[PDB]
Amino acid sequence: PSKLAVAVVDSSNMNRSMEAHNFLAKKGFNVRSYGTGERVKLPGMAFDKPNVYEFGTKYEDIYRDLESKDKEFYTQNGLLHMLDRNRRIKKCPERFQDTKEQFDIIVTVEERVYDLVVMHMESMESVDNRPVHVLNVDVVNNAEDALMGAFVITDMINMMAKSTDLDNDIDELIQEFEERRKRVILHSVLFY
């Protein structure tokens, strides 16, 4: 509602980013989502046999592929439910290092993703000299924690959206938000 371009970034653009994307879009935010991994990773029959796909593979196709391997197994572990939710948001997972979109706020869901996002934007030369705030809100990679994390991220973006001058208030806003929730929220600035 405040014209803020928001991005939520994780590893695979499958679980945590899409849960936050889901709630941010329903609140009317200009939101996108990306993963920072090299390929999309989804769990499976064991730790040693994860389902790995190339970024750009449609959620529809990954749904049908998992449906054919073991439809009953991938319904009781929630992956088909998750793929269906993502299918209804956008076509395919996207890699953050490949996008040419620019944002006002970028939210990562763990420090590893934060580091990848920072190293990427620093590896590019500044052209527009446009700053973007990069925030880290830690979210554990499971269904229950992605849900709680998506609430924290949505609440955080909503509080920042209500500011009349976000740049002048963001440090104090994060400060209070952190204290209220006993979290550490890393926060730096990068340039396009």
Binding site: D10, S11, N13, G35, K41, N141, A143
Partner: peptide, 5 residues
């Protein structure tokens, strides 16, 4: 790693 783990 995998999402979810």
């Amino acid at each position: 790693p995998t999402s979810p783990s």
